[PDB]
Amino acid sequence: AYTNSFTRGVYYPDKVFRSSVLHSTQDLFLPFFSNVTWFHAIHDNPVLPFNDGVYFASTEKSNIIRGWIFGTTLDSKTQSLLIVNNATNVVIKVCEFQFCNDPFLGV
Amino acid sequence: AYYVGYLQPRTFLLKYNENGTITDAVDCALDPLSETKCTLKSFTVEKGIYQTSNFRVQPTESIVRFPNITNLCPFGEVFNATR
Amino acid sequence: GVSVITPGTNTSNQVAVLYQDVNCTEVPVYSTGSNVFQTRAGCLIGAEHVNNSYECDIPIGAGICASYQSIIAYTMSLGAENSVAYSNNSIAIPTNFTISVTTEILPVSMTKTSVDCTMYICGDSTECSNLLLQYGSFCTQLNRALTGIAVEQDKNTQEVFAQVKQIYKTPPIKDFGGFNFSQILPDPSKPSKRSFIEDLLFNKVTFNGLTVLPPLLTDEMIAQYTSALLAGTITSGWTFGAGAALQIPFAMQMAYRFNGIGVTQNVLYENQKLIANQFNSAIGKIQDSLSSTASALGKLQDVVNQNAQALNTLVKQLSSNFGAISSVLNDILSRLDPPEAEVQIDRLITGRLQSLQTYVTQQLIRAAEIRASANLAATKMSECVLGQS
Amino acid sequence: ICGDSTECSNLLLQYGSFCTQLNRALTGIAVEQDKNTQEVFAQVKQIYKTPPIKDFGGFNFSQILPDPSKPSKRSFIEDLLFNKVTLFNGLTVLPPLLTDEMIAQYTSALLAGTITSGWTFGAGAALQIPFAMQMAYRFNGIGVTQNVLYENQKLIANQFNSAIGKIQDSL
Amino acid sequence: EAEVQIDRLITGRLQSLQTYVTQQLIRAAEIRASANLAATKMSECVLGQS
Amino acid sequence: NGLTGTGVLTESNKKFLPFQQFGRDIADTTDAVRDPQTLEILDITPCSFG
Ligand SMILES: *[C@@H]1O[C@H](CO)[C@@H](O[C@@H]2O[C@H](CO)[C@@H](O)[C@H](O)[C@H]2NC(C)=O)[C@H](O)[C@H]1NC(C)=O
Ligand SMILES: *[C@@H]1O[C@H](CO)[C@@H](O[C@@H]2O[C@H](CO)[C@@H](O)[C@H](O)[C@H]2NC(C)=O)[C@H](O)[C@H]1NC(C)=O
Ligand SMILES: *[C@@H]1O[C@H](CO)[C@@H](O[C@@H]2O[C@H](CO)[C@@H](O)[C@H](O)[C@H]2NC(C)=O)[C@H](O)[C@H]1NC(C)=O
Ligand SMILES: *[C@@H]1O[C@H](CO)[C@@H](O[C@@H]2O[C@H](CO)[C@@H](O)[C@H](O)[C@H]2NC(C)=O)[C@H](O)[C@H]1NC(C)=O
Ligand SMILES: *[C@@H]1O[C@H](CO)[C@@H](O[C@@H]2O[C@H](CO)[C@@H](O)[C@H](O)[C@H]2NC(C)=O)[C@H](O)[C@H]1NC(C)=O
Ligand SMILES: *[C@@H]1O[C@H](CO)[C@@H](O[C@@H]2O[C@H](CO)[C@@H](O)[C@H](O)[C@H]2NC(C)=O)[C@H](O)[C@H]1NC(C)=O
Ligand SMILES: *[C@@H]1O[C@H](CO)[C@@H](O)[C@H](O)[C@H]1NC(C)=O
Ligand SMILES: *[C@@H]1O[C@H](CO)[C@@H](O)[C@H](O)[C@H]1NC(C)=O
Ligand SMILES: *[C@@H]1O[C@H](CO)[C@@H](O)[C@H](O)[C@H]1NC(C)=O
Ligand SMILES: *[C@@H]1O[C@H](CO)[C@@H](O)[C@H](O)[C@H]1NC(C)=O
Ligand SMILES: *[C@@H]1O[C@H](CO)[C@@H](O)[C@H](O)[C@H]1NC(C)=O
Ligand SMILES: *[C@@H]1O[C@H](CO)[C@@H](O)[C@H](O)[C@H]1NC(C)=O
Numbered sequence A: 001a002y003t004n005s006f007t008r009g010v011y012y013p014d015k016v017f018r019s020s021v022l023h024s025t026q027d028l029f030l031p032f033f034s035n036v037t038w039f040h041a042i043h044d045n046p047v048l049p050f051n052d053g054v055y056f057a058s059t060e061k062s063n064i065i066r067g068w069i070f071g072t073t074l075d076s077k078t079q080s081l082l083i084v085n086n087a088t089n090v091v092i093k094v095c096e097f098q099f100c101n102d103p104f105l106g107v
Numbered sequence B: 001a002y003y004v005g006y007l008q009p010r011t012f013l014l015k016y017n018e019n020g021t022i023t024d025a026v027d028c029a030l031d032p033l034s035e036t037k038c039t040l041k042s043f044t045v046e047k048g049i050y051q052t053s054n055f056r057v058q059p060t061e062s063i064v065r066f067p068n069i070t071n072l073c074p075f076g077e078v079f080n081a082t083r
Numbered sequence C: 001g002v003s004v005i006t007p008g009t010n011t012s013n014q015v016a017v018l019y020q021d022v023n024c025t026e027v028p029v030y031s032t033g034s035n036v037f038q039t040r041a042g043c044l045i046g047a048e049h050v051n052n053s054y055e056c057d058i059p060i061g062a063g064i065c066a067s068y069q070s071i072i073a074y075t076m077s078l079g080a081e082n083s084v085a086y087s088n089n090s091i092a093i094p095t096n097f098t099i100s101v102t103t104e105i106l107p108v109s110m111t112k113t114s115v116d117c118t119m120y121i122c123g124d125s126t127e128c129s130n131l132l133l134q135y136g137s138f139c140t141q142l143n144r145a146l147t148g149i150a151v152e153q154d155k156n157t158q159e160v161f162a163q164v165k166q167i168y169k170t171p172p173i174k175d176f177g178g179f180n181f182s183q184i185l186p187d188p189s190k191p192s193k194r195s196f197i198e199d200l201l202f203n204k205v206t207f208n209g210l211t212v213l214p215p216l217l218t219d220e221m222i223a224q225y226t227s228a229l230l231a232g233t234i235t236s237g238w239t240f241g242a243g244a245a246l247q248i249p250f251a252m253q254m255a256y257r258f259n260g261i262g263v264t265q266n267v268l269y270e271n272q273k274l275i276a277n278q279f280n281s282a283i284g285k286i287q288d289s290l291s292s293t294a295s296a297l298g299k300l301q302d303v304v305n306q307n308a309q310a311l312n313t314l315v316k317q318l319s320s321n322f323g324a325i326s327s328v329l330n331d332i333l334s335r336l337d338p339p340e341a342e343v344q345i346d347r348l349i350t351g352r353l354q355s356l357q358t359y360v361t362q363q364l365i366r367a368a369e370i371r372a373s374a375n376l377a378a379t380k381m382s383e384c385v386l387g388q389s
Numbered sequence D: 001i002c003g004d005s006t007e008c009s010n011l012l013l014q015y016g017s018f019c020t021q022l023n024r025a026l027t028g029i030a031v032e033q034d035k036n037t038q039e040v041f042a043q044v045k046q047i048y049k050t051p052p053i054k055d056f057g058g059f060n061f062s063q064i065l066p067d068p069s070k071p072s073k074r075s076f077i078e079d080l081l082f083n084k085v086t087l088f089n090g091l092t093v094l095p096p097l098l099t100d101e102m103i104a105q106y107t108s109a110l111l112a113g114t115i116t117s118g119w120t121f122g123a124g125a126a127l128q129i130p131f132a133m134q135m136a137y138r139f140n141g142i143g144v145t146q147n148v149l150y151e152n153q154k155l156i157a158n159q160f161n162s163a164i165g166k167i168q169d170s171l
Numbered sequence E: 001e002a003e004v005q006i007d008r009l010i011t012g013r014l015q016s017l018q019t020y021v022t023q024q025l026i027r028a029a030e031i032r033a034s035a036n037l038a039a040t041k042m043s044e045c046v047l048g049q050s
Numbered sequence F: 001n002g003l004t005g006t007g008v009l010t011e012s013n014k015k016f017l018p019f020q021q022f023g024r025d026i027a028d029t030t031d032a033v034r035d036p037q038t039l040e041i042l043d044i045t046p047c048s049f050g
Helices: B032-040 C126-132 C138-161 C196-204 C219-235 C250-261 C266-270 C272-292 C298-319 C329-335 C338-384 D006-015 D019-041 D076-084 D100-116 D132-140 D153-170 E002-046
Strands: A002-005 A022-029 A034-037 A082-085 A090-093 B008-016 B022-027 B048-051 C002-006 C016-019 C036-039 C042-045 C058-061 C064-068 C071-075 C113-115 C210-212 F008-011 F022-024 F030-033 F042-045
Touching: B008 B032, B022 B032, B032 B048, B032 C002, B048 C058, C113 C138, C113 C338, C126 C338, C138 C219, C138 C338, C196 C272, C210 C298, C250 C266, C266 C272, C298 C338, C329 C338, C338 E002, D006 E002, D019 D100, D019 E002, D076 D153
Parallel strands: none
Antiparallel strands: A002 A034, A022 B008, A082 A090, B008 B022, B048 C002, C002 C016, C016 C042, C036 C042, C058 C064, C064 C071, C113 C210, F008 F042, F022 F030, F030 F042
8 A cells, every 4th residue: 555655754964953044955855745655564574675764654552563673685694683672671783693484572 | 554665865945943943844856836945045935936947958869970981801802812 | 947937925836837948849747737838938837828918017028927816927018098189279287286205215335344365265274374475465456445345335425424514403393384294303202313214114124254344424423414404404495505594484485396396386375274284194194105015125125135145155155175175274284295285275275266356346346336326316315305306 | 167067067066156146147137137128118107199180280290100001010210220230058048028019119108298298298197288389388498488489380390390301311 | 187177177167257247247237327327318308308 | 072163162041952962053153062071052252353
């Protein structure tokens, strides 16, 4: 499915401070009034290309969305970053892991 | 349910607040009004005519011409000399 | 080039785009858009065509122009049409009259400014100062013009305002034959002693080696000059501009002024109340005309904006690389080896010198234009105030 | 200065912002020319037409009024003036806002107004008056009494016609 | 060395453009003064008497 | 912290969001810095000359 991103995707380009001034900035932004996909976590965890930055808008009230996995081949050959939330403190690592066709979590 | 976007190298115009927070953003390659706002460096445009940019037509393909130049020499004959 | 005709983002956000000098068969939302109208100055897409003709406000060119009703483009009409029934034995003579008041705004001077000769292009560096000595006497050449311009502006203002040898004060008792001048005379309540119209005019409008000098004539003295001129022209008529000041009642001064333009002096004496009422109504109307309606002071705002934009462009040019490897001199000096450092600083110096030369030339042109306009204003002050035209 | 080149534009971009003024100056001078011509020619709020029957006390204005047989509707002297004088790498010439027809109409309106209404149409509304009683005004305004004109009308008309013919021949 | 050649060409062309712009500005100013004089003359000699 | 310059340091009253480091107004002219040791916003004023 597809959906219209009306005006989302604006972030502070720098760490400078300004007050009441019109500033023109050329940088990486999500274009206004664009097309965004829409996955469903019912009876989706597919592989999605990065392509120099990515957006993410998760609006699930239930605490189901947990983390992300980044890589270039998804194998122990090359390092793969990992971010996992423990509901009280986030853990981030970078070393390799062996790919599993069904990524999961366990506590 | 998690939408996924893809960033692109665009140009934006941002109006900072008095406290330093971003309160308004305007694109710059969407509509002619957006380009006019970019050139004028303001969010309000008064009545009139404005010069924004210019366009030119890009070439499609390439051609090249040369004379017939058909003067083949005995270079191709010595290789087939009987003796 | 391309252009965008819009009625203002206030009213609506609908625009029509015009491609200049293009027989737009190869035009590529607005790839086709609304009806295409091919004109003598290119082609316009986004506005329809009509066969009517009015007076417009957004000129397009070649005798055609567009306006917002959607948006419509037509051919302008020069004005209303009327033919007078000329005959060889008939005349028309007026039987009534009206008195009207207009306005006219004239600029006389701008802000006095100066720029440091060496601080702009060196930024407190000894090597820059050492290398500048090999470029001749550009410093005095680029420094004398600004002082000349400042002196010219000061003399210009002094000669356009100072035209009375004394200061006149209005009598405390004001009975000017029924006329009401209380909206022109200085208000004692205001500490600055400025008229109400002056207050409305004032309220209507709103370092890297460069500085702005303060003008010699402050606002209070200019206001005093204007008040003296106005009191003199009310009380003494116009004889105070030639010799001494000779008092004259206002009614007989107006009688003389009517007699000057042809109408006999009997008319004023028989129609004093109507004239007074009409003058009061007009002077009341001009108050609301100046207050409610803005954009009546375009010239001064244009001059201020042009000067500010020029200064901002000059100060922003300092961040250019100018073909070197860095935009700051100190980092180049402290990071690189001298033999190519001379080349880098030479490139920076020549670029900045070019920018300064361009700025000076633009300032000279603007000063000449302002001087011409102020000379015209001074002539108007000398002719249409101290007498009759 | 580049001719649609990539590396040329990349090298040029590092020279700061300088073409902005190099274009705004030309836009300013174009606006100045438009304002100049509009201010010089446009000074009447209406358009006047000469009456079909023309008897201006013996004067002949045929060689100065617009000719109703040309596509451009121009007078004779304008035609001689137009015929007397005769004259793409990133530069363009913009057409003027006011075409020739508008200028010709403005001049014709001014001429008709000054012929018929005298000088009363430049200070309010247009007031009709015969031409002879306007020539009397104009002589009385220079110190010569109006008695001279009314007794020497034919001589003045003949001299004016001869002078206008002579200037036509000279042009 | 192509960079140096391009720099030389660019600076020469920029100098020529600046000269042309300055000359055009001077001519425009003179033309404006002449037009103002012509407008004043027309206003004070056509609509009245001098 | 790398931002080097010359001027005079004064006390300020402006408010930063909890993540900026140094402010500015226009044309790359810093006018407010916070000291990392104490996290207090300051003001830079150009050193006087004339
Ligand atoms: C901007 O920042 C200020 C300070 O953090 C916010 O607080 C306001 O400050 C002003 C000035 O003293 C007060 O008049 C307001 O009553 C304050 N508002 C609140 C909700 O505390 C302010 O809210 C911020 N936003 C704006 C738009 O001023
Ligand atoms: C003076 O009288 C003449 C003769 O009637 C007027 O000429 C006509 O007036 C009527 C009245 O409205 C108009 O409808 C006609 O169009 C006029 N004729 C022409 C050829 O235009 C003339 O208008 C009168 N003048 C004044 C000032 O009333
Ligand atoms: C000349 O015009 C003025 C107004 O323009 C006339 O004065 C008006 O007279 C009527 C009736 O007497 C009053 O109701 C109005 O209030 C008056 N207006 C003003 C502004 O005073 C005057 O009567 C006209 N002259 C002649 C001779 O009729
Ligand atoms: C001139 O006009 C002003 C403006 O109305 C008059 O000032 C008014 O004076 C009366 C009593 O003097 C006050 O009640 C009003 O409030 C005043 N008007 C305003 C707007 O404040 C003044 O009286 C007039 N002068 C003459 C001689 O008639
Ligand atoms: C006004 O002068 C014009 C000059 O062109 C006269 O027009 C022609 O004059 C010649 C010279 O006599 C005649 O042969 C032509 O027949 C005229 N043409 C027309 C169309 O009439 C015009 O006759 C003169 N009018 C008056 C009243 O003297
Ligand atoms: C860096 O270390 C200094 C020294 O301890 C800190 O300064 C003290 O910070 C505590 C924080 O609770 C205050 O209670 C003291 O009053 C501070 N003392 C002085 C002399 O400033 C400083 O906060 C530290 N900076 C950090 C952690 O960013
Ligand atoms: C893009 O967005 C439009 C409107 O938002 C929608 O109609 C369309 O299906 C989307 N996808 C594509 C491929 O155009
Ligand atoms: C998250 O919880 C797991 C489960 O006990 C634990 O092994 C891990 O150390 C925790 N990580 C963090 C960062 O708390
Ligand atoms: C020699 O003759 C053979 C047979 O026709 C031919 O294939 C070959 O190309 C010839 N060689 C040259 C150099 O002409
Ligand atoms: C702005 O729009 C409002 C409402 O349409 C109108 O009353 C006002 O005159 C407009 N002002 C300008 C400057 O266009
Ligand atoms: C515009 O071009 C078309 C063909 O592309 C041609 O038929 C037409 O005459 C041209 N019109 C003008 C005004 O050049
Ligand atoms: C305008 O008039 C012309 C000629 O009279 C005609 O061909 C055209 O259809 C008209 N268009 C409109 C919109 O009235």
